[PDB]
Amino acid sequence: WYHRLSHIHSRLQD
Structure with a gap:
């Protein structure tokens, strides 16, 4: 889902 951005x-x- 979009959190992978x-x-x-x-x-x-880092």
Whole structure:
């Protein structure tokens, strides 16, 4: 589901 988008932002964040 849509919560998987947070994985793309965390890849840059940490």
